[PDB]
Design a protein around this ligand. Sequence first.
Ligand code: ZN
Ligand code: ZN
Lengths: 371, 371
Amino acid sequence: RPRFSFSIAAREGKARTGTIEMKRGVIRTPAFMPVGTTVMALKPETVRATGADIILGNTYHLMLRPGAERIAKLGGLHSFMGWDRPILTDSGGYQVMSLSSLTKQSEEGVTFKSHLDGSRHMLSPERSIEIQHLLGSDIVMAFDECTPYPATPSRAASSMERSMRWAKRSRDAFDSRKEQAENAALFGIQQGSVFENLRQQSADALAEIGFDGYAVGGLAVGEGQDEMFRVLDFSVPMLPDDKPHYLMGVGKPDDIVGAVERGIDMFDCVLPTRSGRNGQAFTWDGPINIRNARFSEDLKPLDSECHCAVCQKWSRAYIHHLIRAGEILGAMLMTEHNIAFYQQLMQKIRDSISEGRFSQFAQDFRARYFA
Amino acid sequence: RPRFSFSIAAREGKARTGTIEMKRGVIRTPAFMPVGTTVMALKPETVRATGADIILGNTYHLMLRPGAERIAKLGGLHSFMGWDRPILTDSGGYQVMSLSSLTKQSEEGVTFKSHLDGSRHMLSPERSIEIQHLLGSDIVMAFDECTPYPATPSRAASSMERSMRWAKRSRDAFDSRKEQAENAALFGIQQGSVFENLRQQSADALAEIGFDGYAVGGLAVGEGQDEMFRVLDFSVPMLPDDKPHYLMGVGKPDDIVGAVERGIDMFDCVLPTRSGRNGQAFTWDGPINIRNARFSEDLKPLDSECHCAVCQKWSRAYIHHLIRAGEILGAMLMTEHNIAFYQQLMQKIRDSISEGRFSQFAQDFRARYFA
Ligand SMILES: [Zn+2]
Ligand SMILES: [Zn+2]
């Protein structure tokens, strides 16, 4: 297989379906990427069985424990966790802004204190790319600077401009490392907040540098779905049409459908795993919270049509009891179902685009999900 | 299959190996019974894959949540949790003494306040048998009275005597319920503390009543292994030779080996699951605690010979990281390995008895496990 090849097999409006071919496997798009490392209450084989083609690893959490150098010594992230398919690593950026303390930012990078033990750390475009190399990441994210939501025009421009300088530094760091350049892919991140001109400048800068894929950054950070959709409306067409478009950190099933309608090819979110442990189960008739007393004697599966192993085997009543009791098995079952549900959604999206009936699917989905 | 048939295929000294045939399956003896309901961080299929033929359910915890009547309405414990092989249920006794509060004891039974929410509950020989029926238990334990360790001769005698009266009441309650009498088995529990005459009186009383199997009760409650072994030395031969002998709540691998040398056929313990989550992994060279820093870059499996899926797939280093980080997957992997290890131990015990080399195995095991 090649290092990287994105092929678009079918289109409907702005929506696309196709494949990304990489050395460790093929990724079907539009793709949902479960967050592999909290860590999912799932073995890699189970994650694969749900239909996932690729998982995400968070660089911020991994650099804190067990450490990037340690993972490299142990043979890389794939070998360490037992997942042999592609892995995309985030750059560590948003989590440094959101989780760390004593964070000191500059043009060179960011210094910060761990939220776990107050130990000191550094992250720069170069060090982020290096860490992703040590992990053995297949899709490497450029290191960017986030700005807190909401953002003023000036702050949005400054952070976007810094991010583009950092995108160039990320590109150069990646290219300088032979083994990484030849075997992995590098994605750039568009910034510019809600401002169309800044998004255009960011898109132009990233295209001039050249990347294997393009993320729409700065979303799912406090804005509502309407605003997010509006930003996507003008932002996605600015990106190179022939490369994947990745919406980081999104999201709910309806966010995903709407984003695909607007040209997004890749998604990641902790929601199905995070809210899984919290009791929230996704269904075609909308989310339910399994902790609700109404499920205590409900013998139906979490969802009536879901093809996952959990819905084949266990009742709402049993899962209700497990989650109420704080049992590990409850988290295991909820997480498996939610990730399986997300993959089934992605499959339905792929199939409908391939058949030219995605707009119809999106309407039917919304009508039922919100009924 | 019959309701209950225990057949002894081979013997060596006091040790026996054979089978218990029941409606829901065959149990190989000597048997280790994982505690199925905390709840194991394992799907039933995984528990079965480790080699378990039967699991234990705790009546005390189940009566508190989700409730015995509720489980019955939902189709019984097997259907509820998705395990279709035999289940043995404890009576709820020791846990009432150990976990509950406001416990008021009498000849009729015990009243107590839940340790979860302070709700009031009752347990008697009759109600315990009824609860086990509602759960759909295959092996039902008589309801007994425990006495705190250590026990005076008088207290040991009084509690043993009450337990025997309660054993008769348990027998009669079981027999009166047609569906239970015809489909399940009933085990009696020998009491009498460290006192040989009381153990003999208890054995005689239980044999006169008649049960399908006989537990040695009142052990693993604070006494050391030497004392436990001494009590077993004289207690086990008092029980009917042609019925299974069950040592409740035991135990460490070396406890199990020594107990089989003394005639025990069945075991249950939370240790492999409980200490699994705590970081303790069993190996043929003795237990290790995976949280220890010496394992942080150890690429070997938990045990060098173990045939379990965890030892096929993941390193000590990865599991070390998961447990240190408090990840659910760490508990999953540790629990699977520990239960698999216990089943492998039981298999080696069964095979060596069948081949007349169990005494040799026991010696070789101890030499290595304690090396
Ligand atoms: Zn499902
Ligand atoms: Zn193992």
